């Protein structure tokens, strides 16, 4: 083999490693930002505070790496 040992690429399990590091959900992959430091995924609406949109910059860093 899989690409994720933690969820064995079971798309019907939550995974905070290859999906949203905060809630684990794989829904709205278009709204899951990839930290340009640790390469985790984050729902814009899981961040505290939530981002109403996908940032307009060239890089983004999650609350754990900033």
């Amino acid at each position: 083999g899989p690409s994720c040992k933690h969820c064995k690429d079971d798309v019907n399990r939550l995974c905070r490693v290859c999906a949203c590091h905060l809630c684990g959900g794989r829904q709205d992959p278009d709204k899951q930002l990839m930290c340009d430091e640790c390469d985790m995924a984050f729902h814009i609406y899981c961040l505290d505070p939530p981002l109403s949109s996908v940032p307009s910059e060239d890089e983004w860093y999650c609350p754990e790496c900033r």
Binding site: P29, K31, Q32, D36, D58
Partner: peptide
């Protein structure tokens, strides 16, 4: 540009597509 999970997933799909074919 900020990368999304979707963008990353699409790139892996594209890479896979080329090997699915046979690399050309």
């Amino acid at each position: 540009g900020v990368r999304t999970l979707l963008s990353v997933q699409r790139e892996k799909m594209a890479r896979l597509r080329y090997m699915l074919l046979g690399g050309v």
